[PDB]
């Protein structure tokens, strides 16, 4: 009986696409896939892949059934810091004590049920964690209000609606709300979360119950930030993928993994399922030898060879040359297909705009859909990509020609601004897509308020053409 039956998918994951497990999908189009990610912290991608593979290999080899331990978490973090200069500074492998860890949270990484769960965390009140509106200051956040100071728990539901509304008022992608983590008993809290996980997992019978326990605890580990940095990589890109692979599910390819603080466990199950679905889509697209185009990104032969030359992960090679003969791929595939089915009947057009490429399937999806349905903007709680976006915004960010063509035919309002004040045009300019932009402009110029639509300003007071004029520009002090 295998320990991590899901390792099948880690091997099935194409070598030249392996970086997708660590690099947020949100970066792909704008940062040459993984290039922007590796450049901020050279070495990280090799370190993160080695961490995931070496530890997966540790648990698959042991006779004991997999149980969470702080030593394991500590090893994961040490492994994520190897060769990384940016992470050597804050000592990897060792825990935080009284060192402060603070960060800002925008509306786009939050939900009302998320904020309710967050304020309801007794270890946040007990540990003296801070949360509320303010500004970034000289020595950390300058809080106007701290919601954990004299928090009446009865008030939590209405306060969560107010905190969310306040966060939106500032801007979906703007940071007004700050979080200062616990500076006492982090070692006790890390052990208590570990204890809770190990105890609760044996309680869950269904796969969907196990997923809620898994995310519920990964969230508590993220919210408690036990290390100075590499908290995300350690818990969501590493730790999380092991119990997923223990259930025989693939690892998670995230668009925006930075939602484990202010999203609810139920909403995180969906976020994780969507991310498991991206691994399935990459693997299937690679099997059928179809160029992978997820999240509007088309890799170049130059990007692929550079990554292949940069790849150095001995434990990943061990997994790639590993035997899976006494493992049924069909049953494994059928289990994840059934697990993922929940994602099917939810925002059909939006998911269509992200995943659907066949014009016949697209034409059928958009048949008998009304004006409110085709112009629908998903509300708070759905995975971050959907929030405030129309099928048209999503079709533009995905490079979905066939969906955009169909939406134009169904007469979708291309002037609708998302929660960042951006139109389909703003995104076309940012992505650098000439065809999508030309297609929208033809529509815009065939209407009366053309000049008004072209001059629509987003949250940053920028026009689609400010973004177009800024497209491709380097991040270097260079003459040419």
Ligand X SMILES: C[N+](C)(C)CCOP(=O)([O-])OP(=O)(O)OC[C@H]1O[C@@H](n2ccc(N)nc2=O)[C@H](O)[C@@H]1O
Q: Which residues bind ligand X (CB under 6 A)?
A: 24, 37, 40-41, 44, 103, 225, 229-233, 257-258, 261
Element holding 333 (H helix, E strand): helix 329-340
Partner from ligand X, a second copy, none binding residue 272, C-beta < 5-8 Å depending on class:
none
Partner from a second copy, ligand X, none binding residue 41, C-beta < 5-8 Å depending on class:
ligand X
Q: How far is the CB of 438 from a second copy (least distance, A)?
A: 3
User: φ, ψ for residue 134 (rounded to 5)?
Assistant: 180, -150
Q: How far is the CB of 165 from a second copy (least distance, A)?
A: 34
Nearer to a second copy, 322 or 445 (CB): 445
Q: How far is the CB of 456 from a second copy (least distance, A)?
A: 12
Q: Is 186 in contact with 96 (CB distance < 8 Å)?
A: yes
| Residues in Cβ contact with 269 at an 8 Å cutoff, skipping those fewer than 6 apart | 208, 211, 212, 215
Q: Binding residue for a second copy (CB under 8 A) from 122, 301, 476, 477?
A: 301
User: φ, ψ for residue 378 (rounded to 5)?
Assistant: -65, 135
* Residue 233 CB-half CA count within 13 A: 31
Q: What b/e readout covers 155-190, taking b as 16+ CB neighbours within 10 angstroms?
A: ebeebbeebbeebbeebbbbbbbbbbbbbebbeebb
Q: Which residues in 392-431 contact a second copy (CB under 8 A)? A: 402, 429
Nearer to a second copy, 171 or 399 (CB): 399
Binding span for a second copy by CB under 8 A among 38-46, 82-90, 332-340, 462-470: 462-470
Q: Is 133 in contact with 164 (CB distance < 8 Å)?
A: no
Q: How far is the CB of 29 from a second copy (least distance, A)?
A: 12
Total residues found in the chain within this entry: 480
| 458: nearest Cα among 171, 175, 256, 176 | 171
Q: Binding residue for a second copy (CB under 8 A) from 1, 476, 477, 480?
A: 480
Q: Binding residue for a second copy (CB under 8 A) from 145, 149, 442, 452?
A: 442
Element holding 453 (H helix, E strand): helix 450-454
Q: How far is the CB of 143 from ligand X (least distance, A)?
A: 17
Q: Binding residue for a second copy (CB under 8 A) from 54, 78, 439, 453?
A: 439
Q: How far is the CB of 191 from ligand X (least distance, A)?
A: 19
CA atoms of 118 and 264, how far apart (whole Å): 8
Nearer to a second copy, 333 or 439 (CB): 439
Q: How far is the CB of 449 from a second copy (least distance, A)?
A: 11
Q: Look at the alpha carbons of 121, 124, 125, 127 in this order and tell me if their dihedral is positive or negative.
A: positive
Beta bridge partners of 143: 134
Partner from ligand X, a second copy, none binding residue 261, C-beta < 5-8 Å depending on class:
ligand X
DSSP assignment of 185-241, as one string?
A: -HHHHHHHHHHHHHHHTTT--SHHHHHHHHHHHHHHHHHS--SSS-HHIIIIIIITH
| Binding residues with a second copy: total (CB under 8 A) | 36
Partner from ligand X, a second copy, none binding residue 230, C-beta < 5-8 Å depending on class:
ligand X
Q: Which residues in 358-397 contact a second copy (CB under 8 A)? A: 358-360
Separation in Å, CA 357 to CA 193, 194, 367, 406, 434? 42, 43, 16, 11, 19
Q: Binding residue for a second copy (CB under 8 A) from 372, 473, 474, 477?
A: 473
Partner from ligand X, a second copy, none binding residue 333, C-beta < 5-8 Å depending on class:
none
Q: Which residue's C-beta sits nearest to ligand X?
A: 232
Q: Binding residue for a second copy (CB under 8 A) from 39, 155, 435, 447?
A: 435
Nearer to ligand X, 253 or 375 (CB): 253
Nearer to a second copy, 320 or 363 (CB): 363
Partner from ligand X, a second copy, none binding residue 451, C-beta < 5-8 Å depending on class:
a second copy
* DSSP 8-state code for residue 421: S
Partner from ligand X, a second copy, none binding residue 359, C-beta < 5-8 Å depending on class:
a second copy
Partner from a second copy, ligand X, none binding residue 357, C-beta < 5-8 Å depending on class:
a second copy
DSSP assignment of 424-438, as one string?
A: HHHHHHHHT-HHHHH
Beta bridge partners of 102: 180
Q: Is 179 in contact with 103 (CB distance < 8 Å)?
A: yes
Q: How far is the CB of 473 from ligand X (least distance, A)?
A: 19
Binding site residues, a second copy, CB under 8 A? 300-302, 305, 357-360, 402, 429, 432-435, 437-439, 441-442, 445, 450-451, 454-455, 463, 465-473, 479-480
């Amino acid at each position: 009986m295998p320990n991590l039956p899901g390792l099948y998918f880690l091997q099935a994951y194409p070598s030249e696409e392996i970086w997708r497990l660590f690099v947020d999908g949100r970066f792909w189009s704008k940062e040459n896939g993984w290039r922007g990610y590796e450049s901020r912290e050279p070495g990280c991608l090799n370190a993160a892949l080695e961490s995931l593979c070496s530890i997966a290999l540790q648990v698959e080899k042991s006779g004991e059934e997999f149980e969470l331990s702080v030593d394991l978490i500590k090893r994961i973090h040490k492994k994520c810091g190897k060769k990384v200069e940016e992470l050597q500074e804050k000592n990897p492998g060792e825990l935080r004590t009284d060192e402060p860890v603070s960060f800002g949270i925008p509306a786009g990484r939050a939900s009302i049920k998320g904020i309710e769960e967050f304020l309801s965390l007794v270890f946040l009140t007990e540990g003296g964690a801070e949360f509320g509106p303010g500004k970034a200051g000289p020595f950390g956040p300058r809080f106007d209000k701290n919601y954990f100071k004299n928090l009446n728990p009865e008030q939590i539901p209405d306060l969560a609606k107010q905190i969310y509304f306040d966060m939106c008022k500032y801007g979906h992608s703007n940071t007004n709300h700050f979080y200062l983590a616990v500076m006492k008993n982090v070692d006790v809290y890390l052990e208590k979360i570990t204890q809770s996980y190990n105890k609760e997992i044996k309680t869950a019978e269904t796969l969907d119950e196990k997923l809620k326990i898994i995310v519920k605890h990964i969230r508590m580990y993220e919210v408690l930030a036990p290390f100075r940095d590499a908290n995300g990589r350690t818990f969501v890109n590493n730790l999380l993928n092991i119990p997923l692979m223990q259930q025989g599910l693939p690892p998670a390819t995230f668009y925006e993994p930075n939602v484990f603080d202010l999203y609810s466990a139920e909403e995180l199950v969906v976020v994780v399922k969507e991310a498991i679905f991206n691994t399935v889509e990459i693997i299937e697209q690679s099997k059928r030898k179809t160029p992978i185009t997820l999240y509007g990104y088309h890799s170049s032969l130059e990007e692929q060879t550079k990554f292949r030359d940069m790849l150095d992960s001995p434990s990943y090679e061990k997994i790639k040359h590993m035997d899976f003969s006494d493992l049924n791929p069909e049953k494994l595939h059928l289990k994840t297909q059934k697990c993922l089915s929940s994602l099917n009947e939810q925002y059909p057009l939006h998911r269509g705009a992200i995943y659907l490429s066949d014009p016949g399937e697209i034409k059928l999806l958009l048949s008998n859909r009304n004006e409110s349905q085709i112009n629908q903007q998903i509300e708070q709680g759905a995975p971050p990509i959907y929030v405030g976006k129309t099928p048209a915004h999503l079709a533009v960010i995905s490079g979905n020609m066939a969906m955009l063509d169909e939406l134009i035919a169904k007469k979708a309002d291309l002037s609708l601004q998302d929660y960042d004040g951006k139109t389909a045009l703003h995104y076309a300019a940012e992505c650098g897509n000439m065809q999508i932009m030309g297609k929208i402009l033809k529509v815009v110029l065939s209407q009366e308020d053309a000049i008004k639509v072209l001059n629509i300003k987003d949250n940053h007071g920028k026009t689609a053409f400010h973004y177009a004029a800024e497209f491709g520009t380097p991040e270097l002090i260079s003459a040419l």
